[PDB]
Amino acid sequence: NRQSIINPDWNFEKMGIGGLDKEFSDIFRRAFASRVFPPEIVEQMGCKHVKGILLYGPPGCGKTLLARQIGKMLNAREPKVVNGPEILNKYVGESEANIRKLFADAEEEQRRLGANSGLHIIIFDEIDAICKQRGSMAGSTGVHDTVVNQLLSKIDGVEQLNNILVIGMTNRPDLIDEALLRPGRLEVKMEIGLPDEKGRLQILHIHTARMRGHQLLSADVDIKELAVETKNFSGAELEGLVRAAQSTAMNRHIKASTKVEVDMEKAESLQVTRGDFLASLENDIKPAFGTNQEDYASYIMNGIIKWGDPVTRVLDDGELLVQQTKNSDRTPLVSVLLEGPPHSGKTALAAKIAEESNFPFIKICSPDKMIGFSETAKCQAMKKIFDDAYKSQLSCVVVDDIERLLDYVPIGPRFSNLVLQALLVLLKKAPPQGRKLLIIGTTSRKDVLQEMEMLNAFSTTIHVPNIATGEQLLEALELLGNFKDKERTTIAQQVKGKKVWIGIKKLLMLIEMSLQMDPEYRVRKFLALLREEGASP
Amino acid sequence: DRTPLVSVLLEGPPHSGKTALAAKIAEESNFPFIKICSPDKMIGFSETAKCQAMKKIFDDAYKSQLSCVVVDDIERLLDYVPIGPRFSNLVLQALLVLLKKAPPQGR
Ligand SMILES: Nc1ncnc2c1ncn2[C@@H]1O[C@H](COP(=O)(O)OP(=O)(O)OP(=O)(O)O)[C@@H](O)[C@H]1O
Ligand SMILES: Nc1ncnc2c1ncn2[C@@H]1O[C@H](COP(=O)(O)OP(=O)(O)OP(=O)(O)O)[C@@H](O)[C@H]1O
Ligand SMILES: Nc1ncnc2c1ncn2[C@@H]1O[C@H](COP(=O)(O)OP(=O)(O)OP(=O)(O)O)[C@@H](O)[C@H]1O
């Protein structure tokens, strides 16, 4: 006999697994090298084969698809599939009999024909329902322990059986019995991670090819655009997106308020447009998990307007700092402080500076999540964030509204002390070797921080000014453009007399409040407001 | 549309009728969601209880597309007494945080 171990009519393309391919190459190299090679060389070498494969990873990836495909790829006895904990039975000693029934046939075949038999595949799905720790599973009955012991004794006992392949997949590997996770049993273990950009492109092509073939897909569709937009989608979500888009297109030809009807004409004219894809992205499907999903639209609701010189100066300084921290050896840690009068946009400029930087790891720590936290929880949250930041090669973090992060209030003073000591030490310590860290701080009250003796721990400070000249006020108004030229001249005629001191966050409020009155009283009302509230140096 | 959050502080001498003028304005609003967070419903609570209650009310108030909420007798909500003075710090930080948080988009 010259039985082959691979189906001659096989191709890696038809398997359709997408971005795993390096994982699949590793699996093949380890699991089947011993069998592909011709007999005499291995006979001389006398190398045993591996028996147990363990696949693990988060929900919705290849794993079941991959196991179904591996089972299909070989040309041998059909696999026997076990769907989770269907082994358990209500009589004493009925579980072990069931388990051994699986391997009985392989034992017999090996014993009869010797070393020239075929291959048998046993696929354990949801293996964590069975092989939980015998030292941890509930003490109410033996059966879980005796099942584990039966499996361990049978997979690699005193009698040597070396013609069986057992495949396992799970979600929480660390619970599995370590005596099962040792060479010669379940030995190769691999992580099926979330797909990268290229993998997304592959998956999309695989699911779109058939529709392409018949010219149902409209030519405007740009797959690469879709790939770029879709961040953290898994394979399952990537399929569901396409399904939802097709459904949105197909529904267009059905009536269903009165008794259902379908147009036998337009049934011939169906196509999917890119607009359906856009629509499905926001209404129907949402990606779970993922890292980022930042709502910068909530931190920077109005973008920026370059109402004068200082905005550019500030942004230039921030860019310089980023560039420096990018390429340096002596000083792997850099810390910058932003401060100025209240209502001056201190947060928006910080967030924009961060976003222009293109570091892989960008996170903002803010008190708005921490409402009612004790003096302990805050420490935990901060420690967690910085631990995360230390993993990635490059990381930039923003700590905003320090004064509210301390619970400061002027009557005592009163503040939390633990938080301040944690903040000082976390600012001081250097990151792990070869990584680099940037920290951007925001505060309203410089002098207080100076008093607490933490101003020194920052490397440098940046001053964010507010509007100082009436000319700048006029320019900011023009950039907003909420008033007509005649109103502009009317304002100018009086405003030019004296300088003004007002922060832009208050400017917007005043404008909005002024718009509410009748047209003939707007200007005057505005003026009155600017007069009454603007009294300040 | 550009000022999703608006705040107003009714103020005056004692025994003058602040709470009533206030709940009359809320009634005439005719908004979909209206709530009143008075201090007399939480007699004998500690700090964490108060924080949780207020947090719950605002979390529900973000679910309607528009809402009105009344916070009357601040002076009693945070336990102030002239001798000292003494007060709860936690409640005050809660207020100063919640007054500056924009709701979810479009609300
Ligand atoms: N890498 C991928 N390439 C192509 N299709 C994929 C990929 N990952 C998942 N899919 C598709 O999404 C679905 C994944 O189902 P599958 O059972 O493999 O997920 P799983 O996470 O292994 O299952 P479980 O939830 O039990 O862990 C299938 O429709 C499959 O075709
Ligand atoms: N040039 C600008 N710079 C910054 N923000 C601007 C500018 N023009 C308009 N804005 C808008 O004004 C808002 C000002 O409010 P914001 O909370 O950002 O300011 P802040 O100075 O950090 O606040 P606070 O005084 O509460 O600390 C910004 O969020 C942005 O929406
Ligand atoms: N024109 C009015 N304005 C306000 N309240 C009025 C008026 N006419 C009658 N009232 C009545 O006056 C009472 C005002 O009591 P209320 O509790 O509002 O006073 P308050 O000053 O808010 O209480 P406190 O002194 O404890 O703060 C209510 O019963 C209200 O109906």
Short mmCIF file of N, CA and C in Angstrom, two decimals, chain B residues 20-34 36 66 68 70:
data_model
loop_
_atom_site.label_atom_id
_atom_site.label_comp_id
_atom_site.label_asym_id
_atom_site.label_seq_id
_atom_site.Cartn_x
_atom_site.Cartn_y
_atom_site.Cartn_z
N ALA B 20 -40.55 77.41 44.65
CA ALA B 20 -41.84 77.42 43.93
C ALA B 20 -41.69 78.14 42.60
N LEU B 21 -41.12 79.34 42.55
CA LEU B 21 -40.97 79.94 41.20
C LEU B 21 -40.24 78.92 40.32
N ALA B 22 -39.25 78.22 40.86
CA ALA B 22 -38.44 77.27 40.05
C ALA B 22 -39.32 76.16 39.50
N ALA B 23 -40.11 75.47 40.31
CA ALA B 23 -40.90 74.33 39.79
C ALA B 23 -42.03 74.87 38.93
N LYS B 24 -42.42 76.13 39.03
CA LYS B 24 -43.40 76.70 38.07
C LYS B 24 -42.72 76.82 36.70
N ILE B 25 -41.51 77.38 36.60
CA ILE B 25 -40.78 77.43 35.28
C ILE B 25 -40.63 76.03 34.68
N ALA B 26 -40.20 75.01 35.42
CA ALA B 26 -40.07 73.64 34.91
C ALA B 26 -41.38 73.13 34.34
N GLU B 27 -42.48 73.32 35.07
CA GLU B 27 -43.79 72.90 34.57
C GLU B 27 -44.13 73.56 33.24
N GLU B 28 -44.00 74.88 33.16
CA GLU B 28 -44.34 75.57 31.91
C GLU B 28 -43.41 75.22 30.75
N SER B 29 -42.25 74.64 31.02
CA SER B 29 -41.39 74.20 29.92
C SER B 29 -42.11 73.23 28.99
N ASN B 30 -42.85 72.27 29.55
CA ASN B 30 -43.53 71.23 28.76
C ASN B 30 -42.54 70.33 28.02
N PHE B 31 -41.38 70.10 28.61
CA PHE B 31 -40.39 69.22 28.02
C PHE B 31 -40.79 67.76 28.21
N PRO B 32 -40.13 66.84 27.50
CA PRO B 32 -40.49 65.42 27.64
C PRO B 32 -40.06 64.78 28.96
N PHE B 33 -38.87 65.09 29.45
CA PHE B 33 -38.33 64.53 30.69
C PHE B 33 -38.07 65.65 31.70
N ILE B 34 -38.72 65.55 32.86
CA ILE B 34 -38.56 66.50 33.96
C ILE B 34 -38.35 65.74 35.26
N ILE B 36 -36.93 66.31 39.64
CA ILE B 36 -36.60 67.18 40.76
C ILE B 36 -35.79 66.36 41.75
N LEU B 66 -34.28 65.68 25.05
CA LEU B 66 -34.10 66.89 25.84
C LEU B 66 -34.79 66.76 27.19
N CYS B 68 -35.13 68.56 31.54
CA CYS B 68 -34.94 69.63 32.52
C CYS B 68 -34.81 69.01 33.91
N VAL B 70 -34.01 69.95 38.17
CA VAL B 70 -33.96 70.97 39.21
C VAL B 70 -33.18 70.43 40.41
#
